[PDB]
Write a protein that binds this ligand. Structure first.
Ligand SMILES: [Cu+2]
Ligand SMILES: [Cu+2]
Ligand code: NA
Ligand code: NA
Lengths: 620, 620
């Protein structure tokens, strides 16, 4: 009965039926996005009204539509025609990816370029990539993908080992036209294979690894009710899934004695951008908005027991829509389990003679997505002591190019003639905060160094300072690792037993933010990525830091437009947006398949509790 | 037969006999430090000579001595008398701790201060703390401890809940005189108890945690030979133990095909300092050098199976000397085990149809120490992919004070009337590098942003730059998180298959360094803590960043004096010293016993291998 339950196959089928009945889903229509809307602000509100948001593409070239449907009542609530040259194109459809290689295989400019390189078109794979917004006026209002070529020597070959540099093509996937083919010159195609299951490359497999067996003889310590409501070691939350954002956590709360205390109303990764730093015209347009352009939940993997998730695993299998409105199950797409996490607290006291040790554990909620060559794991952790942490795991195969004779300032060499362009992987976490309720504020905390002198005669004192962010115009903040800068989200109307406002402290990793020139297309489209922390006043329609329609959309939407409203955020319903990412200069060890690298953030209680919340953990 | 084997009980007994017969270990003598010396540099050192270094204290006031003995030959190699006003006092003896409380209990000034506060002297515990060097000219050349008082209401009570503020005493522990008693005023003694095993405070214990069973049905994947030589998943190393430094790793190497390739010759935590930032004269002198002043190895815990170390555990039980030269075993003082570490690499490839997942593992070497109220865990990790990581875990009970009426800029409130002064925990890792051999150099790597313009028309390019550190005077470096600064240790004479020098990259956490005023006593004595990275030329006698005799040394010893030699470090035998630490503003949740917080660093291969080193890991 919970309003936060996962979408069911029947709900998606019913949305299909409602759209069909309304005349909105004829044979020329495709569903590019479908997802459940969260309840509006208001305790109780409608007893039950499940509403869905749909983006509807038209393959004949007519204008697309944004539609909201009530599956409970069987009604279309609103339907608006979109002017995509103004507000952005819809997300890329899975069926449009296949179009690109097929169209290029019959284009005489493409065939001439491959013939000049002595390449067989039947062996050339084309990576179909999002287009962005650059200097090509004919692309405005059209759905464009750009293609880069790789050779596959045989059907099981890793094409990523054999980039065809100097060549790029642009394709209109609705009119099925190749608009431009650009050939800047022949580069040798790197010849070494990158087949990481070939015994010639792996050598004999290790025989030295003995098994590690992780079991839970009495089952796990968490309970799952209503399909997706979790209770674990005083935590309470609902696990959602959205085709765009992937796993979404709702209603994160902590049972403190007899009271369920809210902490975070909604937590998600609301965008992720992968900008490339190679100025070659073959790749200087290359920027993936995996969330906003491709929809990461759509490409979620089925996770295999014992390989992907080890231990006593509970799975969720979320349902999404295909392009025609039929439900599709992602079997075993979300893994949930608890993990031992070392020592929690320990002290051996000389004076009392008491020796005390307790162990920690964490609850893990994770999913993995694959987008072309890259594979990303998204991990949410809850700890016994009240800490909440997010970790992204990046692996897969690095995107390759030729390595130029004479070297490069923007490309790493991985193998003879094989390069890997520099790039970043930058995430935006949207944290709809609810620390003890919705009246919240953000303070920036810096360490304060003090000068030796009166009142500090030995020059040892140091302190800290907290600055309240009171309006959106002052709530765009940068990291400062040297001064230990953190941000505290507090509730000024809820005090702990020492009469201090309860709070949580956000600890960032302080990695570099977006490196592109501030005047670049990517800096305008991914403005969120240029600053570490943004705070906005909550609003129903302010969902993504890049806006609703990211594909081929110029600047003008998203966080810079939201904060211009300069709303009061001092003791209000607020949303924290945290930018964090990895800057990747590829190394030889990343080839031919990359070991996991990680980045994340965490939030720790800061006077939220009246004392340690884990004094009641037993010894076992 | 290995020169790097742990010291045995028999070796320590031989040292005792040698000292005794040489007349160096009379009844007035105490051993303040005893440890084995590493072999001198020599790629052909065959004749085994086990040598021990000893610091001998004299309780009657005679000059202490530094002695080197050969246990192989049964001889005293050298014995030097020390002038401690010049070169520093010897480490604090465990037996001097109790002397402070006993001497104060009969001092009329101390008793009068307690009587004014209505405190029973039999209930007053005194923390005996290191003195440092401040304004008191009468302390130069004398062994001083300073004492702070806490009330224990009953024998099993946590005295840390009841600090007696406004009172401090100084004690000469050799002449057994109380030199000063300072009473700055009466503060209420906080009355709430902090007994974290009292059911009245814990409440009923949780019944919700179900067991997690971690077993290795075929045994562990590592082997231990010669007592302390580890082989695990291509790694090879020796696990040493020193009473000052604790666990020391020797001869870290990686078996790459047919070659055993050195990486690090010796890795240790060579100092750790805990400076306090409260300007009250009761505490403004307070700075713990846990390694240099107290010796963290001698307070190592015996680690309990299933509580401290969980899984299939292999223990080492190192032997140390007591104050009279008798061997003392620290039973189960070092835990060794391997742990599952999630996904190592993963890719699902559309074009080849191959789905690939591999799991990661790490080898863990750990010990725990207790120094008064604090407990520290030291963890070294080796990963399958060549990564080396260190993690310190801080827990225990925070050091307390009164919380002043009207508040404080330098103390947190934990409970009614109970404060916790601000402080840091700063570590120095000493990494005697040996990347493919001893000819190494360090480069500083910064991200480079590029401006939009010719050759970068779309404003997307970015790059990096590397600066070689060529002499010690230019090898004192600061972090810069904003530019992604890392340091690369490479061997300019050993190239990978792409003809680039092999290297390892040091990734710091970029936490704040020492906050004290640069003119302060602590900044002079802990100068290492003021900068993130130091590089020196290797020398046999440059062991600790703070010098050999840290206790009551006036300042400048260790790294500032080593660096002043300005030696060539460009392609030489070099040592990297990395400073890293936690800045602790105590929170309510840290009381009455603190959940673990962590800090560390890691090193990752950077073109050390010719491709990923984990292609031969099986699916399992
Ligand atoms: Cu990358
Ligand atoms: Cu601390
Ligand atoms: Na909110
Ligand atoms: Na070295």
């Amino acid at each position: 009965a919970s309003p936060f339950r996962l979408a069911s196959a029947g709900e998606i089928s019913e949305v299909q039926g409602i759209l069909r009945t309304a005349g909105l889903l004829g044979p020329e229509k495709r569903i590019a996005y479908l997802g459940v809307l969260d309840p509006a602000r208001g305790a109780g509100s409608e007893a039950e009204d499940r509403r869905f948001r749909v983006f509807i593409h038209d393959v004949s070239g007519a204008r697309p539509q944004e539609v909201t449907v009530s599956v409970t009542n069987g009604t279309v609530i609103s339907a608006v025609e979109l002017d995509t040259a103004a507000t952005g194109e819809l997300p890329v459809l899975e069926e449009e990816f296949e179009v690109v290689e097929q169209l290029l295989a019959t284009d005489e400019r493409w065939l001439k370029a491959l013939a000049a390189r002595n390449l067989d078109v039947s062996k050339v794979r084309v990576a179909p990539l999002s287009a962005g917004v650059f200097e090509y006026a004919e692309e405005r209002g059209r759905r464009i993908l750009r293609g880069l070529a790789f050779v596959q020597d045989f059907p099981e070959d890793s094409a990523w080992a054999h980039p065809v540099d100097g060549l790029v093509a642009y394709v209109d996937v609705v009119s099925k036209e190749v608009t431009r083919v650009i050939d800047t010159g022949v580069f040798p195609v790197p010849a070494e294979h990158g087949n990481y299951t070939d015994p010639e490359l792996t050598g004999p497999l290790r025989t030295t690894q003995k098994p590690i067996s992780i079991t839970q003889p009495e089952g796990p310590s968490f309970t799952v009710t209503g399909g997706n409501h979790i209770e674990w070691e005083k935590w309470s939350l609902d696990v959602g899934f959205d085709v765009r954002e992937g796993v979404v956590l709702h209603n994160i709360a902590f049972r403190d004695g007899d009271r369920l205390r809210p902490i975070i109303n909604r937590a998600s990764i609301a965008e992720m951008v992968v900008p490339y730093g190679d100025p070659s015209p073959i790749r200087s347009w290359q920027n993936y908005f995996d969330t906003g352009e491709y929809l990461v939940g759509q490409y979620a993997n089925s996770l295999e027991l014992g390989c992907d998730c080890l231990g006593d695993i509970t799975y969720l299998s979320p349902v999404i829509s295909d392009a025609f409105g039929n439900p599709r199950e992602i079997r075993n797409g979300i893994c949930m389990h608890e993990e031992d996490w070392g020592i929690l607290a320990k002290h051996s006291d000389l004076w009392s003679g008491i020796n005390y040790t307790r162990r920690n554990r964490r609850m893990v909620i994770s999913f993995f997505t694959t987008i072309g060559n890259y594979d990303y794991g998204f991990y949410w952790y809850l700890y016994l002591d009240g800490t909440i942490e997010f970790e992204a795991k990046a692996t897969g195969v690095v995107f390759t190019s030729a390595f130029p004779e004479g070297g490069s300032d923007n490309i790493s060499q991985l193998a003879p003639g094989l390069g890997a362009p520099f790039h970043q992987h930058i995430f935006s976490a949207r944290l709809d905060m609810a620390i003890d309720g919705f009246t919240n504020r953000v303070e920036e905390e810096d360490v304060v160094r003090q000068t030796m002198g009166p009142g500090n005669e030995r020059g040892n004192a140091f302190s800290r300072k907290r600055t309240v962010l009171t309006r959106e115009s002052e709530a765009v903040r940068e990291a400062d690792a040297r001064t230990g800068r953190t941000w505290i989200i507090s509730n000024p109307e809820s005090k702990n037993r020492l009469n201090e406002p309860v709070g949580y402290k956000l600890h960032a990793h302080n990695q570099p933010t977006l490196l592109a020139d501030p005047g670049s297309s990517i800096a305008r489209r991914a403005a969120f990525a240029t600053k570490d922390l943004w705070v906005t006043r909550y609003a129903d329609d302010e969902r993504y830091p890049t806006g609703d329609f990211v594909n081929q959309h110029s600047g003008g939407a998203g966080l810079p437009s939201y904060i211009a409203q300069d709303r009061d955020i001092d003791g209000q319903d607020i949303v924290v947006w945290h930018t964090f990412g990895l800057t990747h200069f590829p190394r030889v060890e990343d080839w031919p398949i990359m070991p996991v690298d990680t980045v994340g953030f965490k939030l720790r209680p800061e006077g939220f509790f009246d004392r340690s919340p884990v004094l009641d953990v037993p010894a076992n």
